[PDB]
Each structure stands twice: as C-alpha cells, then as structure tokens.
C-alpha cells in the first residue's frame, strides 16, 4: 500500500493513482511575488459556532478529527467559493524536524506542519460524491511554526497517547476548531487536489497567509505517534507530507495586497 516511505511514498503514488501526474495536483509552492491580488475575491466566511466533533483516529498516515456533517453546523463560504461547504474533518501533516512538515511552501519556505480543515460542497449531498467533482471540496490550510504554544491545540495533543498506533480511535467531543485559527483570514487560493491517494482533482485550496504558533512540546507529541500498527516494528509518524507539485497551467490568487 501507499504511504510516506522510500518504497511507497509520494514518488510511487502515480503507479496506483495515475492522477498523481495530473494538471491540478497539490500541494504547490506559493510564489508570493507571482500570486495575483484579486480584488474580486471575498472575505472568507468561517462559521464554526455549532461544530460538533465526534471522534479522533490514527489511520496509519496521520490522525483525523471527524465531525458531524449531517447538517450545516460548521461551514465555510465566501472567499473564492460559490455555495456552502460543510466541515467533515481536520488533520495535520508534520515533519521530523521543525524545518519541514508543511505541504504547501511559501517562496520555498517549509513550515513545521500544516493543518487541513476539509469541507465538502453541500450541493453534492455527501463527501464521496463531492470528491468526484472539480468544485467538490474546499480545504482550508494553515501553517504551523514552532514558538509559543497554541492553547486551542492542547486538547488534541493531550489525547494522542490514546491513539498511538494505526487503527486506534477514541471519542473526541466538544473540540472547537476556532481555537486553531490565526487572527487574519488573508489567503491564497488555487484549484488543486487531495494530497493523498486517490489524489482526486476536486479541491479549491484556501491557504492562510498567517501561520499559527505551536510549541515544541506540542509538535513533540505529534512526533510520538506511530505509522505502524501495534505489534509491528515501530516507525515514528513523521514526514507525512507530499512535496510541492508542478503548478502547470494555474494561477494562485491572493485575497490581499
Ligand atoms: N490532505 S488533504 O486535505 O488534501 C485530504 C483531503 F482533502 C481529503 F478530503 C481526504 S479524504 C479522501 C481520501 O480518502 C484526505 F484523506 C486528505 N488527506 C489525508 C492526509 C493523509 C493522512 C490520512 C488522514 C486523512 C487526510
Ligand atoms: Zn492534508
């Protein structure tokens, strides 16, 4: 199966998922000087007031916090988007060291981690259907740098010892994702893809300019997770990021400047 290692990592994925060499793959490097300010772009509307987190899983690739998306409770709209996108889950990608871990890069700079809040367009009724559409998903990406702790992340990190190995899950209620957001909602946006198999080209990416700060203690807890299932040789879950892919025939638009 696919993963993040030498024999099954990103450079191999195209064998099982030919779309890996497609025209709108993610992530990308965001050239800040080349991104076009678009005064037509709207402020992003993040309405996470009624979010209902349900569970947290270690799936052997990352961990994901999944939400109740059976009614508009936590929705994204505006920005570059037409229509309403419901939040289904968030997850992170991170590195073995603080100088790598993000999927997107900014003028080639890598961040220590990247948070993805995954939303699906309600016009398609369910996330599976939405993933088959070019405007099906909107992923809000937030960079993490290491410095001051993020208090709103602490409830996540403190639960990770309970899901150390692949397949372990736990109930995870009343987590408020508003505590993961930076002050500014200035963003870059472009059409792209899932960053893991099946790599579907179904995502409107919205990448915030302003990172959040997390502490070294917080990211050390991410790096204590394991890729392996219990009983298998121990492999620390680190460097679960896809590198930047060719921009091809895309422009990155900026909501600011
Ligand atoms: N990274 S991402 O935000 O483009 C992303 C989606 F938008 C998705 F909608 C999904 S779910 C559809 C794939 O089966 C996804 F897995 C990822 N990637 C996964 C990261 C790899 C580790 C698995 C944990 C799930 C998220
Ligand atoms: Zn992701």
Description:
- There is one protein chain.
- The chain is mostly beta strands and 257 residues long.
- It has a single domain (1-257), classed as Carbonic Anhydrase II, CATH 3.10.200.10.
- The chain has three helices and 15 strands.
- It has helices at residues 127-130, 154-158, 216-222, and strands at residues 29-30, 36-37, 44-47, 53-58, 63-67, 75-78, 85-94, 105-106, 113-121, 137-146, 169-171, 187-192, 203-208, 212-214, 253-254.
- Strands 2, 3, 4, 5, 6, 7, 9, 10, 11, 12, 13, 14 and 15 form a 13-stranded mixed sheet that branches. It has a two-stranded parallel ribbon with strand order 1-8.
- Strand 6 and strand 7 (85-94) form a beta hairpin.
- The termini are far apart.
- The relative contact order is 0.24.
- It binds the ligand NS(=O)(=O)c1c(F)c(F)c(SCCO)c(F)c1NC1CCCCCCC1 and zinc ion (ZN).
Features:
metal-binding; binds zinc ion; 29% strand; 13-stranded mixed β-sheet; monomer; lyase/lyase inhibitor; two-stranded parallel sheet; 15 strands; mainly beta; lyase-lyase inhibitor complex; 257 residues; binds the ligand NS(=O)(=O)c1c(F)c(F)c(SCCO)c(F)c1NC1CCCCCCC1; drug design; benzenesulfonamide; Carbonic Anhydrase II
Short structural summary:
A hairpin with a 4-residue loop joins strand 4 and strand 5. The strands form two sheets. Strands 2, 3, 4, 5, 6, 7, 9, 10, 11, 12, 13, 14 and 15 form a 13-stranded mixed beta sheet that branches. The protein has a two-stranded parallel ribbon with strand order 1-8. It is 6% helix and 29% strand.
């Amino acid at each position: 199966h696919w993963g993040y290692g030498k024999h099954n990592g990103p450079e191999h994925w195209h064998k099982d998922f030919p779309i890996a060499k497609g025209e709108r793959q993610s992530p990308v490097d965001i050239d800040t000087h080349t991104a076009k300010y678009d005064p037509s772009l709207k402020p992003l509307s993040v309405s996470y007031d009624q979010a209902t987190s349900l569970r947290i899983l270690n799936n052997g690739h990352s961990f994901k916090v999944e939400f109740d998306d059976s009614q508009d409770k936590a929705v994204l709209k505006g920005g570059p988007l037409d229509g309403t996108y419901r939040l289904t889950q968030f997850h992170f990608h991170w590195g073995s060291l603080d100088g790598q871990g993000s999927e997107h890069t900014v003028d080639k700079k890598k961040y220590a981690a990247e948070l993805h809040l995954v939303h699906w367009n309600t016009k398609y009724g369910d996330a599976g259907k939405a993933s088959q559409q070019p405007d099906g998903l909107a992923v809000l990406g937030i960079f993490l740098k290491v410095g001051s702790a993020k208090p709103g992340l602490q409830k996540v990190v403190d639960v990770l010892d309970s899901i150390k190995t692949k397949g372990k899950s736990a109930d995870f209620t009343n987590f408020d994702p508003r505590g993961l957001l930076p002050e500014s909602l200035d963003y870059w946006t472009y059409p792209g893809s899932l960053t893991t198999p099946p790599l579907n080209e179904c995502v409107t990416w919205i990448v915030l300019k302003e990172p959040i700060s997390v502490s070294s203690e917080q990211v050390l807890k991410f790096r204590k997770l394991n890729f392996n299932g219990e009983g298998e040789p121990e492999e620390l879950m680190v460097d679960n990021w896809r590198p930047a892919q060719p921009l091809k025939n895309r422009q990155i638009k900026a909501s600011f400047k």
